Amino acid sequence: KLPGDFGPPRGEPIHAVLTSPPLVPPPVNRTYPAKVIVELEVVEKEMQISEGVSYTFWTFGGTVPGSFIRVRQGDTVEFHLKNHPSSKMPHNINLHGVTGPGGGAASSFTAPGHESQFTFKALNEGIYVYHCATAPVGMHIANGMYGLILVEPPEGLPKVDHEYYVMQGDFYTAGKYREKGLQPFDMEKAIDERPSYVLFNGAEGALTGDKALHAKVGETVRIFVGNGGPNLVSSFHVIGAIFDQVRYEGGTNVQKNVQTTLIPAGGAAVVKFTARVPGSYVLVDHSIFRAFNKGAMAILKIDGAENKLVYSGKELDSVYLGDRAAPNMSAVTKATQASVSGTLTVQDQVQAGRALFAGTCSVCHQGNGAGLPGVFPPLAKSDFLAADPKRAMNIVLHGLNGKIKVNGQEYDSVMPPMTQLNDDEVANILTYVLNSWDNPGGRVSAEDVKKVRAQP
Amino acid sequence: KLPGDFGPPRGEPIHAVLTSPPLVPPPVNRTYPAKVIVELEVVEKEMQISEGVSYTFWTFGGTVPGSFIRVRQGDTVEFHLKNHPSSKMPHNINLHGVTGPGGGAASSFTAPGHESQFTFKALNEGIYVYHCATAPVGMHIANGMYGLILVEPPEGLPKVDHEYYVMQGDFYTAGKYREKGLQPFDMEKAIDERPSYVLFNGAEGALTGDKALHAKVGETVRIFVGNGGPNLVSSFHVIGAIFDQVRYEGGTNVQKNVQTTLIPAGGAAVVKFTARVPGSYVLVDHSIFRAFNKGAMAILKIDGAENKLVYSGKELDSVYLGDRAAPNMSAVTKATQASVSGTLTVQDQVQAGRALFAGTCSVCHQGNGAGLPGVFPPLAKSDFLAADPKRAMNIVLHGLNGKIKVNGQEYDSVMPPMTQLNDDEVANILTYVLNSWDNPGGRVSAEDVKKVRAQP
């Protein structure tokens, strides 16, 4: 007999439990094969990919990644794909782990307002990516059409305290990283495999700050980790921790005691972690510019007792978490909305600048702007700043080096350029600085920065 | 004793069986070590990399990938490399799995019209890439100079019903993807790892349509899978199926029951598949823009009985196979030749357009141009098209959105731009549309499209 040869479906049909990320459906907890009816609906919708940056996502079930599907090896799955009548595109589905043409894609082609169905036996146990397979396939996947399906072994997976759902994807916007507004898909960037964002669960900050995953010291955590791509291979890593186990798809091989593991485009793995020390543990793609310049960071926050014999030291994690150490960056979202409305206040800018100043500036100038005498000059009550507050725009954009004097102290160092910052970002940061620490006040606009950036 | 310590060569020397892709030489079927004489000749030659796109390939044995070499662990191999006198470049060979300097490259340097020889013992069992290692090494590999050598274990590999030879490579043309004509190698793209094509066996469509690999339900298939690079790592995947086994090079580890596996640049693996359900099973690099935008798709076609208990659904695989669902795209080849000759007819364009319309347009407008009332507007007898057939060029290149009326029905949707299409492609597709379904006829030329593309 084939694999999953467990007998005919028994009992009543089961109408399947789908879940939204980062959560997983419960274990099926049964010892017999069932007929499982799955209903999944495609929805095309604008969502925020980053604070003040909107994108038209194409979704399975209203989320990126799509709704999580959980069945048992040997089940017969009757799959219903609906395409919402608001959709502009046709869609379909390819489930990895399906035995058949297109993994279902050949049978699930569904126009807006229609529904398709096909049936498959889940022969292969494992964790599997599913995704849309409608031409142009890459555009559909790039727009967010991917998720996971778990096919349990017949005895179920071992019990753990938490199960979570995390999926990486690469995204291609016409605009640059953190450029505000509704950003179109960019086919040229996509073909060249040059993403503007690389994210977990469809957005910057999806799993950071107040949206972190949780567990307690001593608890076990299983994460179902997908890589939807379309194009990147993840050097998937947990900062400050180790994986007890890493298992790809339905593979017989299991790797144990590793921290860094390569996930193919379209690949999926199950990882397991045991919490040992409190704090924030960071899931990243260790192709590091993805993690720290394009959004590829997610957090597991562990609460419980300290273990000073295992780890003893200070906890200044804003030095690397930067602007994602805080609970959120809602001040940026709000400043952007107010700017679109034409109602942007000085305070709107100050609070957005405060959020962005973390990491970006604070690593050298400190959270309080004091700097460090002789090494980093102060922004707090800075005579150099007050002498020519406009020149601060050039300093941020193009850097500063050479001998300067600030508040009666000599400096001879190097501030790197930060040209990657967008005009609103520079404007907001500088407005924050001007309105803090007894600086002269006033404001810098995005338009001011635009003019300075354009100077030869 | 070293590995492969099986005794001295016995018997008469064996003059080795080389094969062209996608076929493999027979199992050596012997229990003793032999002296094996291998003769391989380099040939530089123009071949079609895509329909109407020529490239000057540099080849081992006249093909990309090069001729497959099959020996037994413990054999002594006397390797003769000839370089055809028509060659312009010198060449050599590095066989992975060889124990010695350059894997042979140090001893096989061969000018045009010359022959070299070196001898090695095959100590290491496994599947191995070989390639040219002549400066500039990357240019030689990019031009197609790679293949596989199998070193069998002494007892042979387990018997299977079919053995096939598939090798991925990344290619670098001065022109864009599907731009017609003789395309030079592009060193700048190659250094930047920005390929224009990513292919199996040296050409788009090498293993699709009427050139698919075959097997029957119940049969086992072994594929020797190489990645010649030069630069890309393949997220190697089979759509709608699973690999029973994946083994890299001569490694002791074997992974079982996986669908997606990472093959390094210069890597090789042996995969095994058991056919379970009829249909087309697609080998891809799941860095998806490679598979669906740059040519990285190959097909294994399985014939036999349906198994509706395992898979039950419709078979509309043109939705993802697109223009590669058909037996071939020879109409494109022919239209391109006629265009070069100055003898391009309306019918030449119509048939080339018909081939390209599959996937590219048919996913929304349907194979018969009818569209779907209220959702996708018709191209069949389209009053909107007839009203300004020229505007169709702008629609294809730059998309269309907003409210329009077509054949007495209102539409308010979005047709994405398709700027990646080349001028001949747009011209041919539109000529096909104009001459089908009682549309007004006439034709669009590549030159017409060029003018429209150049408008600001």
Add this chain to the structure above:
Amino acid sequence: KLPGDFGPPRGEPIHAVLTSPPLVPPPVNRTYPAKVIVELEVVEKEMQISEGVSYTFWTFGGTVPGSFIRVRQGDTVEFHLKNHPSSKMPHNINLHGVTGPGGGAASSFTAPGHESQFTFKALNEGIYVYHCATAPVGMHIANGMYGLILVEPPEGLPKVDHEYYVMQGDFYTAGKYREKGLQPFDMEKAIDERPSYVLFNGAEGALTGDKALHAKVGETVRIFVGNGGPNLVSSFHVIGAIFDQVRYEGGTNVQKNVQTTLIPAGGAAVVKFTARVPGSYVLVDHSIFRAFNKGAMAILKIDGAENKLVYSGKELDSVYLGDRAAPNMSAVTKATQASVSGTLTVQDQVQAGRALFAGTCSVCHQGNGAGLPGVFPPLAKSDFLAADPKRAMNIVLHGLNGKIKVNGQEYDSVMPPMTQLNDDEVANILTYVLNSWDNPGGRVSAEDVKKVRAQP
């Protein structure tokens, strides 16, 4: 108990042995857990990334990669990070394998002239990358802030004859590959993952020529192999040899008998090799343009007796090692310094050209400039060259094809363009050619080449 539950530290504290690449500290050779005090100092310093190309590296311990740290599983490590007062940036450290927030980064933030300390228990055996984790994290890593820490199993690793330390990194210069002078970090290239250099141990030629690693026939070699990134995944390969074992981080899985293995960004592996045949064995990233166009080649040189039954052939390894076959390229370094000083002589240029001519030109024109009658035309006493020595600049930059006559012999072949060569390189090569083999003498300057390159 956790992992590494071996008891409390015993004995006196041990002040740890750090080593500079390519060497490793000795095995700890003990059976009890210790308190180990580690002192590591950050130094920012200019070094040569390539001959005549300077870069401002940021280093742990004065080298790239940083000093190697070696402890035993179950040790308590008291980590002191100093930041030299000459530093312009703050720094910190994240050690993979540490159980705690940021792998230490949260507790080791250190301004110039300061010192930090934190303590951790080494629970996890394995080889691990460490790196700086100070915002912007990618810039710090790109500038060279990474190394390895080995956490031994309690019984120690098996004995071998040699242990070496090799770490790959990708680097991002404003200038192009081999463009001379002090090269700034290029943030735009880094974000796009488009490195100008890909190196082992921080420099082109760090481990080639007279800086090769050594062993003898019959000896075992262990290499601790890191990939610091920041961005690339290495298709890590040894030319002409095989790895007996490859083990990632602290993983339970060990792969045996492979030649090509994928190392994630931020990953580390221990590989083992047994020397069998004399010669030069090349460690490369087999994304081949990295290895042969961006510096990603290192050498293990094996001395001892020939084994003609295993490998019998000539040894012309300059065909692929090119300009790295020689002991060094010091003539390039010297010519560049003299050019900066305004004291560049004809002889300075001749010797620099001689070094660069290897591989680059010699593969076709031969080491003695004789070429091959009818196939490659001579540079030795070339009438074609003497007829218009200036035209040689265009020939190098833009190639040459078609019918020509040289020293009374007809040629009809193709010399590819070599536009990637920098102006000084072309000038030096041509000066070498003009002053060798009874050619007319004189010289070509970088400024001459610049003018020709700029012609339309």
